[PDB]
């Protein structure tokens, strides 16, 4: 096993690999620090993430072995990928603490967001990447729920890395599909889609598409645009206040987005109108979308991979602490890190 070495950065503990050199803090989550560090291994810079009281509880415990199960099956280009694992225990009894290591982007999309001026060839390649990774994604029978802003990585390349969490260091409600607000509690993939479409606004306008104050308040902004729920879907909601308050409200007809977005690529305007759109069932897929003339510069069905099938089984399972310690330790041993370019 390889040489570590012990410091103090943001009033926590670090213990690393040699081989990780010039640790520094980037930003941090709920569940985790990130420290950007130099790989003398390959002379690039890395992402270092530890993780927080992994194994505080059962659901620290599960949400250590999903995000460390779900990394480690992670295999595309333009979504966050493991290039090591380790913990500075020689010993399960030992094993308390875990980091993950990744490539280090350039900044979060609302970094970029920050300038305000995307250009209309920025928002194809920044789009086209998102749905790339997020075809990969769904192959994997794997649903994100909770995409936005801080989860695109990008470098100054231009090149995106959907991140699974990203740096809190943006209320979320922002970016929900209405059905999650609702709590439906049963989610198509195109929750996802719905959230790509909120982001895709953003970076065409230079403001949020729904900036909403709540959930009732962001269903009132949703249902401005794209008008009040049609009679074929107010059939599938069983919640009767759900309904009554849908029904109750004064009624809106659909804006036409041609307005809303003027002086948009109007290729970019019917890709919007195709993503926004209440019905779940009716949204574009990711796949489906990368076909889109407005992806006509950047697509390619030849390389536009699909990822081998993930088994969440586990997620049904109600184990211990323990035994979520000693399979997600399993995981640590049994990593196999990519081979360097
Ligand atoms: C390593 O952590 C992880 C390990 C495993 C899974 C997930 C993670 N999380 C995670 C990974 C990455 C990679 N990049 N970024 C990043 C965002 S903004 C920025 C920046 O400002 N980079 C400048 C400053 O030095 C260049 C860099 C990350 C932020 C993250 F939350
Ligand atoms: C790189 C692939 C990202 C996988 C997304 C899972 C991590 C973010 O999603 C998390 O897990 C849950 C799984 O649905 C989501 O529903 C929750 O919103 C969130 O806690
Ligand atoms: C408040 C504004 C109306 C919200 C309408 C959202 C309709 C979402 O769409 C629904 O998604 C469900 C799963 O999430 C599916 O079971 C339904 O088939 C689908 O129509």
């Given amino acids: 096993r390889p040489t570590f070495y012990r410091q103090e950065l943001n009033k926590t503990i670090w213990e690393v690999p ?41 659901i620290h415990a599960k949400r250590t072995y999903r995000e460390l199960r779900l990394l480690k099956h992670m295999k595309h280009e333009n979504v966050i990928g493991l290039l090591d694992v380790f913990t500075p225990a020689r010993s399960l009894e030992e094993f308390n603490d875990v ?13 970029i ?27 994997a029978d794997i649903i994100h729920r909770d995409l936005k802003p801080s989860n695109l990585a990008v470098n100054e390349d231009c090149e995106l890395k959907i991140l699974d969490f990203g740096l809190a260091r943006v209320a979320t409600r922002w970016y929900r599909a209405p059905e999650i607000m ?32 709540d959930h009732i308040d962001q269903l009132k902004l ?7 729920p049609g009679a074929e879907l107010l059939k599938k909601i069983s919640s009767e206040s759900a309904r009554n308050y849908i029904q109750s409200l004064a009624q809106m007809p659909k804006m036409n987005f ?28 990711a796949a489906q979308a990368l076909a889109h003339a407005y992806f006509a510069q950047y697509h390619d069905p030849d390389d536009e991979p699909v990822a081998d099938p993930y088994d969440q089984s586990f997620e049904s399972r109600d184990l211990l602490i323990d035994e979520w310690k000693s399979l997600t330790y399993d995981e640590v041993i049994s990593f196999v890190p990519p081979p360097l370019d």
Avoid at 99 to 111: K, P, Q, S, W
Avoid at 116 to 137: E, N
Avoid at 222 to 228: K, Q, Y
Wanted: hydrophobic share 40%; charged share 20%; glycine share 8%.
């Fill in 222 to 228: 949703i249902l401005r645009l794209v008008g009040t």
């Fill in 18 to 58: 040699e081989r990780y050199q010039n640790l520094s803090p980037v930003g941090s989550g709920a569940y985790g620090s990130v420290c950007a560090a130099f790989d003398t291994k390959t002379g690039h810079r890395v992402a270092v993430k530890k993780l927080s009281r992994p194994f505080q509880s059962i």
């Fill in 258 to 285: 041609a307005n809303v977005f003027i002086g948009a690529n109007p290729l970019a305007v019917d890709l919007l109108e195709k993503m926004l759109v209440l019905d779940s069932d009716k949204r574009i897929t």
């Fill in 182 to 213: 609702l709590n439906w509690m049963h989610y198509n993939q195109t929750v996802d889609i719905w959230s790509v479409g909120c982001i895709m606004a953003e970076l065409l306008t230079g403001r949020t598409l729904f900036p909403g104050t």
């Fill in 99 to 111: 980091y993950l290591v990744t490539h280090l982007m350039g900044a979060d999309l609302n970094n």
């Fill in 113 to 139: 967001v920050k300038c305000q001026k995307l250009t209309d060839d920025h928002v194809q390649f920044l789009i086209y990447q998102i749905l790339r990774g997020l075809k990969y994604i769904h192959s």
